[PDB]
Amino acid sequence: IHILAFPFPAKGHINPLLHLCNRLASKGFKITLITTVSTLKSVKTSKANGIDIESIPDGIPQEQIITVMEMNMELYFKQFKASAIENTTKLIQKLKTKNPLPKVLIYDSSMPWILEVAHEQGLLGASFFTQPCSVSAIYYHMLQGTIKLMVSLPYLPLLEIKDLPGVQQFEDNSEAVAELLADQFSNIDDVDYVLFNTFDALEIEVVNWMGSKWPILTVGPTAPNYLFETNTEVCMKWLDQREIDTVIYVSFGSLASLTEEQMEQVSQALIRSNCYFLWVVREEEENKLPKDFKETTSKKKGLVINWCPQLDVLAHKSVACFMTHCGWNSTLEALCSGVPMICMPQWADQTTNAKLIEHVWKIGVGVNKSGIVKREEIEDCIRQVIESERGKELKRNAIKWKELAKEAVSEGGSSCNNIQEFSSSLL
Ligand SMILES: C[C@]12CC[C@H](O)C[C@H]1CC[C@@H]1[C@@H]2CC[C@]2(C)[C@@H](c3ccc(=O)oc3)C[C@H]3O[C@]132
Ligand SMILES: O=c1ccn([C@@H]2O[C@H](COP(=O)(O)OP(=O)(O)O)[C@@H](O)[C@H]2O)c(=O)[nH]1
Q1: Which of 286, 313, 330, 349 to mutate for ligand 2's pocket (most ligand atoms within 8 Å of CB)?
Q2: Phi first, then psi: what are they for 125, rounded to 5°?
Q3: Angle, vertex CA 343, rays to CA 337 and CA 346, nearest 5
Q4: Which InterPro entries match (predicted)?
Q5: Does 176 lie in the same domain as 285?
Q6: Are residues 271 and 399 in the same domain?
Q7: Which of 108, 151, 155, 331 could pair with 8 as two cysteines, CB 3.0-4.6 Å apart?
Q8: Could you tell me if 326 and 214 lie in one domain?
Q9: Would the CB of 280 count as within 6 Å of ligand 2?
Q10: Of the ligands numbered here, which is closest to the C-alpha atom of 305?
Q11: Nearest bound ligand to CA 138?
Q12: Are both 215 and 245 inside the same structural domain?
């Protein structure tokens, strides 16, 4: 059985879908992964997957595709949509001349209009949600008009205004982003399969509520591996020199960027903490680091790298905590790895994830802005996690969640059962 997979063109959307594809390929399915040309330019390793990669045009002007969208999200997301509709149609028409014929298209939930392409081509459509049910519920309420972006929503903790998904940070892209998030639920009744990268035990009540509206399949964590350059050997050799529970892993993901002034705060907090640290600073961001930071002043205790093998880093026993922007993949990967967090959310669902991390799952602490987070606050959070009694509690809580995540993906577990149900439905 031949499955097509079409992620939104960004690493937090590609990666969780890739991991689901790898699990499906392990069960005997053929996989074709559909990527934009801009994504393929960053792809360095794919021979070992056995998954076929088929590219489509970016469909918006070239100058990554994402940094073009941000220039004008309202227009360029719509141009991306129209081009993706045309070019995935053309690609599927071609794939229908080859055996095995495609049967289902799994697409990122942010691209609901791909359902119409799947159905027009005679395929089943599966919408793949890359954020948890608790945060997706807010987008559903946004579509319903129940909330426009203290706040009480069914089966969610009481939220402050600050805990709602942050779109005001995007300035003139705010309304376009709020619309795209809400439109994930615009055709949910017509989707053949609704897949969420979460597991039931993590959010029992909101998953139960969602399931009373639509049949949903919680299949997460989909993560068990890399398409992009991860500097694996350099990172893993450095971590192998570190003793247990001594390393702060620091990463703000694939998209977020911090100001030069904020970078200085983080640099100084890491140095004066006197902890070992592995800090992912993307290539296009390292110019904002203090002058001799990468080459000299970080060499005694730190490794500054443009990308790491994050699953392998979070699995390493030297890692004591994860200073994170709280993107959903990073949050879930840290929880499933038993790694407590220091929450520094930037925008979109990161704000809500940071609330869930700190107050519901209780595996992290959050920083306080002054709107710059200062070194002393970061140092204070580091001391709380690394040294204080509260930090031992967060570590114990993270280990309990690791165990529940292990149950979910093992035989008889909720996510294993749901992937089996999906897999059998196709057979
Ligand atoms: C505006 C922008 C800011 C960061 C950077 O400069 C890029 C900007 C343009 C893209 C934007 C990004 C913010 C986060 C997104 C909305 C995110 C997404 C997409 C679909 C979805 O369902 O959920 C979340 C991933 C990426 O599409 C984002
Ligand atoms: O050095 C890094 C940093 C991040 N990641 C991966 O990149 C994704 C980041 O996704 P997330 O939802 O956390 O945030 P985003 O980048 O979408 O804002 C996750 O799959 C991480 O495992 C990685 O492989 N190496």
Answers
A1: 330
A2: -120, 130
A3: 120
A4: Glyco_transf_N, UDP_glucos_trans, UDP_glycos_trans_CS
A5: no
A6: yes
A7: 108
A8: no
A9: yes
A10: 2
A11: 1
A12: no
Q: What is the rounded distance in angstroms from the CA atom of residue 200 to the CA atom of residue 219? A: 9
Q: Does residue 18 have its Cβ closer than 6 Å to ligand 1?
A: no
Q: How many domains does the chain have?
A: 2
Same domain as 241, residue 105: no
Q: Which H or E run contains 250?
A: strand 247-251
Among protein residues, the one with the nearest Cα to ligand 2's atom 22 is 310
Distant-in-sequence, close-in-space partners of 336: CB < 8 Å, separation ≥ 6: 221, 223, 401, 402, 405, 406
CATH label of the domain that carries residue 368: 3.40.50.2000
Ligand 1 site-directed mutation target among 63, 76, 177, most atoms within 8 Å of CB: 177
Considering Cα of 94, then 99, then 103, then 107, what sign does the dihedral take? negative
Shared domain for 255 and 204, answered yes or no, is no
Q: Is the CB of 328 under 6 A from ligand 2?
A: yes
Measured CA to CA, the distance from residue 135 to residue 415 in angstroms comes to: 19
Residue nearest to atom 14 of ligand 1 (CA): 348
Q: In the structure encoding, which two tokens stand for residue 66, read together? A: 């994402």
- What number does the ligand 2 atom closest to the CA of 307 have? 1
Short-list 34, 36, 31, CA closest to 20: 31
Q: Rg of the Cα trace of the chain?
A: 21
Give yes or no: residues 392 and 417 share one domain: no
* 80 token code pair: 């991306």
- DSSP letter string, 355-394: HIIIIII--EEE--------HHHHHHHHHHHHTSHHHHHH
* Technique that determined the structure: X-ray
How far apart (Å, rounded) are the C-alpha atoms in residues 424 and 323? 40
Q: Which atom of ligand 1 is nearest to the CA of 70?
A: 9
d(CA 142, CA 124): 27
Please give the Cα distance from 375 to 145 (Å, whole number). Answer: 40
CA-328 nearest atom, ligand 2: 12
- The residue range of the domain holding 264 is 232-405
- Output the CA 12–ligand 2 centroid distance in Å: 5
Evaluated on CA atoms 41, 16, 342, 230, the torsion sign reads negative
228 within 8 A of 9, measured Cβ to Cβ: no
Resolution (A): 1.9
Q: Tell me the CA–centroid distance for residue 348 and ligand 1, in Å.
A: 8
